[PDB]
Design a protein around this ligand. Structure first.
Ligand SMILES: CC/C=C/CCCCCCC[C@@H](O)CC(=O)N[C@H]1[C@@H](OP(=O)(O)O)O[C@H](CO[C@@H]2O[C@H](CO[C@]3(C(=O)O)C[C@@H](O)[C@@H](O)[C@@H]([C@H](O)CO)O3)[C@@H](OP(=O)(O)O)[C@H](OC(=O)C[C@@H](CCC/C=C/CCCCCC)OC(=O)CCCCCCCCCCCCC)[C@H]2NC(=O)C[C@@H](C/C=C/CCCCCCCC)OC(=O)CCCCCCCCCCC)[C@@H](O)[C@@H]1OC(=O)C[C@H](O)C/C=C/CCCCCCCC
Ligand SMILES: CC/C=C/CCCCCCC[C@@H](O)CC(=O)N[C@H]1[C@@H](OP(=O)(O)O)O[C@H](CO[C@@H]2O[C@H](CO[C@]3(C(=O)O)C[C@@H](O)[C@@H](O)[C@@H]([C@H](O)CO)O3)[C@@H](OP(=O)(O)O)[C@H](OC(=O)C[C@@H](CCC/C=C/CCCCCC)OC(=O)CCCCCCCCCCCCC)[C@H]2NC(=O)C[C@@H](C/C=C/CCCCCCCC)OC(=O)CCCCCCCCCCC)[C@@H](O)[C@@H]1OC(=O)C[C@H](O)C/C=C/CCCCCCCC
Ligand SMILES: CC/C=C/CCCCCCC[C@@H](O)CC(=O)N[C@H]1[C@@H](OP(=O)(O)O)O[C@H](CO[C@@H]2O[C@H](CO[C@]3(C(=O)O)C[C@@H](O)[C@@H](O)[C@@H]([C@H](O)CO)O3)[C@@H](OP(=O)(O)O)[C@H](OC(=O)C[C@@H](CCC/C=C/CCCCCC)OC(=O)CCCCCCCCCCCCC)[C@H]2NC(=O)C[C@@H](C/C=C\CCCCCCCC)OC(=O)CCCCCCCCCCC)[C@@H](O)[C@@H]1OC(=O)C[C@H](O)C/C=C/CCCCCCCC
Ligand SMILES: CCCCCCCCCCCCCCCC(=O)OC[C@H](COP(=O)(O)O)OC(=O)CCCCCCCCCCCCCCC
Ligand SMILES: CCCCCCCCCCCCCCCC(=O)OC[C@H](COP(=O)(O)O)OC(=O)CCCCCCCCCCCCCCC
Ligand SMILES: *C(=O)CCCCCCCCCCCCCCC
Ligand SMILES: *C(=O)CCCCCCCCCCCCCCC
Ligand SMILES: *C(=O)CCCCCCCCCCCCCCC
Ligand SMILES: *C(=O)CCCCCCCCCCCCCCC
Ligand SMILES: *C(=O)CCCCCCCCCCCCCCC
Ligand SMILES: *C(=O)CCCCCCCCCCCCCCC
Lengths: 138, 523, 138, 138, 138, 138, 138
């Protein structure tokens, strides 16, 4: 279970605490909702977790040869269901915003949904870093 | 950009082979690459010396950099002779392929720059050094220069055989011809191996490799926890070898072995074998000399993918080997041994490592005759399945009442629990390597440790249970033996080290155990 | 199961969140549907997952020498079907977009089908980065 | 329990004692509460401590083969709950402070909430290092 | 079963999705049909998969040294037939397109047959990349 | 069975698909028939494939020492025949074409025989690359 | 036992002896108490040390499988409590000092509380090295 809970404007990593952050000001246009994924392509740990638990269920039908077959068919089926479920617990609701800076530009940034509700037009206060940006309200 | 010079046909392709996007600031890499996409190509126009050098006008006021690419083309010079001096073994043939312009071709210094360096990966030069025809201005050479038997002594200590010596002379160049001649000698509790060895790595110009092995394996059993039988064996093998992949190999050869089986502690497991061959000495007295001469054909295969030789944690390593006699010697049999290795690192930072080595075997005597007992497989021990005493796993023998002796009233098959080995072997072990704590984290990435769950199953494929009721059927297909524990391995100026402690959690009666084992020197 | 699911205009990898990525504008022509193949060509993982299930299925017919032949032919047929069936569960719908940037140029980009359906003639905003571009509507 | 305790203004790493720290002065705007994450995203240690305690809790039920099923399902469930509970033993309160230096600028910095309670409009004495900033109130 | 299904203009690899790639225009002359090889030159896998099944078919006939001859003759025959049949599941139909770009040039590009049938005289758009070109019709 | 089936003017490999190749024109003189060799000089595989098959054939004749001599004479005879038949199964019919480019030159190029029967005097096009040239008719 | 004992003004490491340290002078303001946390992020020494001892305390209850349950629950609770106590013997009192150098500046530095008592208003002799500083009182 990847802990992709740090992509909020309401949860910071310990890598960026007690560190100095530049501040810019800007207004906001076009809030729209977007799902956010994370992790690896392959999901190795979920694969084995599925495979073993789906193997030990294979033993529990038949006996002789029909058991030896089912304990492998269940194994590969559980292996597939692994990757099928692990990549389903990283889907996290979120938002994507483009914002009009008072410099006079446009950028867009994507964040996890939080408690705050954005609107099309709001004075949001950027925090910048070495190419890491958060969008706080008001 | 700008072009100032004669490109012989790359004048317009500047914005396609050597382009960037306007506004990009002064770069030493994405502006020098504009120089260096035509600095190497031009040896494809037969041009020998492709020179590209660009010195902008660095303008600061409103910040545009006006590049000026002076490219002047080389000319068409050729490949006459390739000349190596001082070296009596290195060839003008392989030291042509490991360069990238063949003999008789349009030649250039900059497009032979793809050739000079790899010649050193032969492993025998100290340096690999790198001409217009002397006093003639059209044809041209590519030249190189090269700058070019040490004893070794090994003394160890251990648990499986305790003390352990090595000593042998190696000289990987026989008078200047590349033959690899090496000698070795090892002594410990059970065997003393004193071998001579030769090899020619290039039998065919293209890779075939022929080795002839003169060995001698003066072995002994009792000290090695087995039952009793003594072996002084000498034999000689020759094998071919041809590369096919650089990730592979292959081998085949003819191997003559000669053994002197003697001093046997009478027992059924070997006395099945004696009958089938044709030797039935006294069944309770030990003065008997069974002699074998086995000719035997052999073969193999290989695979290498690991990135680092020392403390490797990447790739995949494999091995196969088989063998069979011709049916025209003493004992006839065959043998199939398979090996595996796999170091899976989960991420680039390389602190989590996954390793597991699978091994399989099988042997048989062909025409109803039986595999020789000294050729069997042994499992259990430090190097394979930690926690159980060396060799201790394998269906045990059955001593006869001999001189279990008639002084105490021995009148039957005295059930014994002594390890002998077997003919079908299968060992798996999944290992899950973890970081190195408790030392300074500056250098806490060296001394390796792992938690492991090792299995091992050798059985007698022909053992009987029709005839042995009070004994189980010693050919059970799932008499596995798992074990776990810990051990710490590393390098220190006193050789290779490891210390262990592995608890044998699962086992059967008759299976000994050995919780703790160590390694200094060699095992 | 390869997850070619982040190729949508609707899902972002966790490596592309809380980042500054530029905004350009453009009009759109030439929308046509195209399929996307994601993953590796050799596709070895499914070879084993087919070979073993087709090998244990070979131990179910006949006996003696006739069982070894069956449980090897079944093994190679399982391996072949394995590679054949895995590389046919990466096929994924997608679109080809021919967008005219308001600068005055033209580029095309391919992008996994999501839920929103593009049209012949629309305004899209290019969330651009170091050669990764997502085309959102409006 | 990865030691994410040195992210307050009341606790220092031993790595930055007996070193030179510059002093800047400033006033403060818009304190808002935030949470702080720390440690790993994968939580390897919680995985083991969930896996073994979910395994040995399987052995207490059933027998034969149905024992060998529960004693792996419990292990995988414990493995999930391990990462689940470790990454909930690091959520710690914190604050985000935007501050206006006498230079004439604005920055914001994020810290672990301690005992003292900042105010909306005050004086804070910045301690600066190689891009480490702390806020003491006076 | 190597996957040569990327060689059409109707399928894209995953490494060519969500990327910026230029567009040039052109007309078409001389379309002619061509077959397309692919993959390996050695067929080292078809050789093994043929050798094993050819060996296990040699065990079924004869007894003794009359069998031991067949269990090798069958192995070699299966080994050859392996390469023989594997390099027959890579033959793919395709086309050879010669096209005049509007810049004033002519080029020729080869591409796997798909659904659309190109015509002698038409307009096609050249999707260009770092030395990769795909030809879409209309 | 080395696959030199890509050496025609009617088959392309996989590595040269979907790529831009120049076009040059020309006429043709002096077609003549020629054979093509493809493969190695060591023939390390045909030797083994003939060797084992010629060796097992020795085990059928004689007995005692008379067998163990025939099972080597047969082995080397099979060794010779293995190369003698492998490298005579890579011969391929082909052609050798002189062409005069319209640019003003004359070049030679050699190809595998296909279906079309060229003539001395005809218009043929050179799909050119980085030193690989295929001569298609018209 | 992490050795955070060299953080006083009355203790020096064996590397910072017999080396030249520059001397500067200053006055002192704003002394306040601080806690110093010294050592590793992981506490991976008392974690095992508590794990083993918490394990053997498990074998001493129950019987059979109910024993083998407790001989692991004791481990991780013993393992976790190991870190919780080791990180409680690395807390050390200390002070924060705002020193004005007579150069005309201000800096701050923190130290392990020793035997001398600093005060707000005093003279201190800042000893300096390669970015290492101590503050002796006099
Ligand atoms: C969909 C759901 C999921 C899937 C599966 C679910 C299954 C559900 C129900 C299962 C019920 C089960 O009980 C069935 C059963 O196994 N039932 C079987 C079971 O009973 P149980 O139920 O288990 O209790 O076991 C018995 C064991 O039988 C025999 O055991 C002997 C030794 O054991 C004995 C003894 O000495 O007698 C007896 C035993 O009691 C015990 O004492 C043992 C002891 O262990 C040691 O002695 O000894 C062996 O002799 P040996 O060791 O000394 O050598 C013998 O080998 C022999 O008999 C040797 C045979 C060998 C035949 C070779 C065929 C290969 C074709 C390739 C050529 C093309 C070239 C390019 O040779 C002969 O018999 C000689 C006869 C002359 C003519 C034969 C044909 C020649 C060529 C034909 C070409 C055709 C072209 C059109 C062996 N035959 C045998 O074990 C059986 C052998 C017989 C042939 C059947 C016809 C198949 C034709 C298909 C090919 C089409 C060609 C175009 O069946 C097989 O080799 C299967 C091989 C399939 C391999 C895959 C195909 C590869 C190629 C396909 C093309 C892609 C069988 O009788 C039962 O079969 C029977 O009751 C008869 C009944 O029909 C069943 C047979 C099943 C075969 C189906 C396969 C077809 C599709 C494949 C699917 C993957
Ligand atoms: C808060 C909760 C915390 C829990 C712990 C706290 C307190 C508990 C401590 C003490 C109490 C406990 O000790 C009681 C007990 O153990 N009591 C048992 C104990 O006795 P003692 O207490 O020691 O005295 O042990 C004895 C063992 O019993 C049986 O022994 C046989 C061999 O024994 C023999 C022999 O004949 O050879 C004789 C015997 O005397 C002895 O000699 C042995 C000898 O030692 C060696 O042979 O041999 C085995 O046959 P075998 O060798 O061939 O294998 C057999 O297993 C068998 O025969 C094969 C079994 C196994 C089949 C399992 C597959 C189910 C799939 C689930 C998915 C749902 C949909 C897809 O199959 C069957 O038995 C057929 C049953 C069909 C129904 C199965 C449930 C599915 C329901 C959903 C279906 C879908 C429709 C909705 C085995 N059954 C068995 O051992 C039991 C088997 C029966 C099924 C349970 C029904 C309801 C369960 C609900 C769970 C989920 C439903 C939503 O159950 C189990 O293996 C455990 C199942 C684990 C499932 C986990 C799933 C993963 C969860 C992950 C979450 C994400 C039993 O007498 C007692 O149970 C009985 O007298 C009958 C009783 O009714 C069943 C027992 C309860 C099990 C359930 C608990 C598991 C929960 C998970 C834990 C983390
Ligand atoms: C939501 C619900 C949740 C579920 C929760 C519950 C879970 C657990 C609860 C506990 C109950 C469970 O224990 C029941 C049970 O196992 N009960 C069993 C248990 O009893 P106890 O537990 O003790 O109570 O064990 C007993 C022992 O079983 C038998 O043991 C014999 C040996 O025993 C002997 C001996 O003779 O040597 C004697 C015996 O007395 C004893 O002494 C032993 C001793 O151990 C050693 O000596 O020896 C074996 O013969 P052998 O050694 O020579 O091999 C025999 O297998 C045999 O003989 C060999 C079999 C061959 C079967 C395999 C082929 C299936 C095709 C699937 C793919 C399609 C292909 C493209 O052949 C036969 O059985 C002959 C049957 C002829 C007709 C076949 C029709 C099938 C054709 C379908 C075609 C469809 C096309 C579309 C074996 N039969 C057997 O074991 C039974 C065999 C029956 C045949 C097929 C019927 C159904 C097929 C469904 C397939 C769908 C197709 C689309 O069933 C099986 O092998 C299980 C097969 C699993 C297949 C997994 C999928 C693999 C492929 C994946 C595809 C995606 C059985 O009686 C009980 O069976 C029976 O009660 C059978 C009964 O009638 C019906 C059972 C249906 C099974 C459903 C499970 C599927 C889910 C899979 C999960 C991953
Ligand atoms: C994702 C691809 C992985 C494919 C792996 C397939 C392996 C098939 C194993 C079938 C086991 C049957 C063999 C003998 C049957 C028997 O009676 O065996 C007898 C013995 C024990 O039975 P008794 O208790 O009756 O003696 O062993 C077993 O039953 C073995 C347990 C099998 C269950 C484990 C499930 C698979 C292992 C882990 C999966 C690895 C996945 C890798 C992911 C990349
Ligand atoms: C990709 C092509 C690879 C082709 C390789 C085919 C493998 C051939 C194996 C045949 C085994 C028969 C010998 C013993 C017969 C017997 O009756 O054996 C009997 C015993 C078990 O029966 P008991 O319970 O009676 O002991 O063994 C088995 O049943 C073993 C299981 C066979 C199924 C394994 C699946 C095939 C190979 C695994 C995949 C390897 C692919 C690797 C690719 C990289
Ligand atoms: C974070 O989520 C880490 C991964 C935890 C493992 C999750 C995988 C669950 C496995 C389920 C197996 C179901 C088998 C179904 C067989 C039909
Ligand atoms: C992601 O989806 C990876 C999955 C890898 C294995 C998928 C299942 C393939 C096995 C099918 C085997 C069928 C054999 C039939 C033989 C007649
Ligand atoms: C720092 O906090 C490291 C902590 C190490 C892991 C401790 C977490 C305890 C795991 C509990 C597992 C729950 C068991 C559920 C059984 C069904
Ligand atoms: C993808 O196309 C490659 C598949 C891997 C090799 C499988 C080839 C099948 C081998 C068939 C063997 C036929 C034996 C004939 C006996 C005379
Ligand atoms: C592609 O062709 C792969 C090479 C396979 C080797 C082919 C060997 C042919 C067998 C000839 C055997 C002749 C036997 C003569 C004995 C007297
Ligand atoms: C330097 O100080 C080394 C580390 C010291 C480790 C001390 C471990 C203390 C263990 C206390 C045991 C309490 C366990 C209670 C569980 C119920």
């Amino acid at each position: 279970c990847v802990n992709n809970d740090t992509l909020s404007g309401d949860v910071y990593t310990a890598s960026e605490a007690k560190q100095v952050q530049n501040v810019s000001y800007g207004t906001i246009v076009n809030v729209r909702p977007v799902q956010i994924q994370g992790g690896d392509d392959s999901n190795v740990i979920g694969a084995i977790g599925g495979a073993v638990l789906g193997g030990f269920l294979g033993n529990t039908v038949g006996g002789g040869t029909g058991r030896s077959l089912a304990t492998a068919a269940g194994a590969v089926a559980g292996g597939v269901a692994g990757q099928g479920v692990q990549s389903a617990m990283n889907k996290t609701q979120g938002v994507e915003l483009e914002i009009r800076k008072d410099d006079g530009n446009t950028i867009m940034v994507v964040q996890k949904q939080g408690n705050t509700r954005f609107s099309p037009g709001q004075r949001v206060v950027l925090a910048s870093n070495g190419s890491q940006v958060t969008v706080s309200p008001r | 950009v700008e072009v100032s010079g004669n490109l012989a046909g790359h004048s317009a392709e500047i914005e396609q082979l050597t382009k960037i996007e306007p506004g990009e600031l002064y770069n030493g890499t994405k502006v020098t690459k504009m120089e260096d996409d035509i600095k190497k190509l031009l040896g494809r126009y037969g041009y020998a010396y492709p020179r590209v050098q660009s010195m902008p006008e660095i303008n600061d006021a409103d910040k545009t950099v006006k590049l000026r690419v002076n490219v002047d083309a080389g000319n068409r010079f050729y490949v006459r002779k390739i000349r190596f001096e001082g070296n009596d073994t290195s060839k003008d043939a392989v030291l042509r392929r490991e360069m990238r312009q063949m003999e008789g071709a349009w030649l250039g210094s900059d497009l032979v720059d793809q050739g000079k360096e790899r010649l050193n990966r032969l492993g025998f030069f100290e340096t690999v050094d790198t001409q217009r025809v002397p006093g003639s201005p059209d044809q041209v050479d590519v030249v190189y220069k090269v700058k070019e038997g040490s004893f070794n002594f090994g003394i160890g200590y251990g648990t499986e055989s305790g003390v352990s010596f090595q000593a042998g002379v190696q000289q990987d160049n026989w008078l200047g011809t590349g033959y690899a001649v090496g000698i070795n000698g090892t002594k410990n509790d059970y065997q003393t191996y004193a071998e001579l060895s030769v090899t020619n790595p290039y039998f065919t110009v293209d890779g075939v490799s022929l080795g002839g092995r003169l060995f001698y394996n003066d072995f002994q059993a009792d000290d090695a926890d087995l039952s009793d039988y003594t072996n002084k064996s000498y034999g000689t093998d020759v094998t071919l070898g041809f590369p096919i992949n650089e990730y592979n190999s292959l081998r085949a050869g003819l191997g003559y072995v000669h053994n002197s089986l003697s001093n046997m502690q009478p027992q059924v497991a070997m006395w099945r074998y004696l009958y089938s061959m044709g030797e039935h000495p006294s069944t309770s007295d030990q003065d008997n000399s069974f002699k074998t001469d086995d000719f035997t054909f052999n073969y193999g295969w290989t695979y290498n993918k690991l990135d680092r030789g020392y403390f490797p944690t990447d790739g995949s390593r494999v091995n196969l080997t088989g063998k069979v006699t011709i049916p025209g010697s003493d004992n006839e049999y065959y043998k199939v041994t398979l090996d595996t290795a796999t170091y899976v690192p989960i991420d680039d930072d390389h602190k989590w490592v996954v390793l597991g080595r699978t091994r399989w075997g099988y042997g048989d005597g062909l025409g109803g005759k039986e595999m020789p007992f000294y050729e069997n497989f042994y499992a259990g021990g430090s190097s394979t399945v930690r926690g159980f005493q060396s060799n201790t796993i394998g269906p045990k023998a059955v001593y006869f009442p001999h001189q279990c002796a008639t002084q105490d009233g021995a009148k039957d098959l005295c059930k014994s629990d002594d390890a002998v080995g077997g003919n079908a072997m299968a060992v798996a072990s999944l290992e899950f390597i973890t970081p190195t704590p408790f030392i300074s984290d500056k250098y806490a990435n060296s001394v390796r440790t792992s938690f492991f769950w090792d299995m091992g199953t050798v059985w007698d494929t022909n053992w009987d249970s029709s005839q042995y009721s009070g004994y189980p059927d010693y050919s059970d297909p799932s008499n596995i033996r798992m074990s776990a524990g810990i051990a710490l391995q590393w390098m220190s100026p006193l050789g290779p080290l490891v210390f262990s402690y592995a608890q044998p959690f699962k086992k059967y009666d008759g299976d000994k155990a050995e919780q703790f084992q160590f390694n200094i020197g060699k095992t």
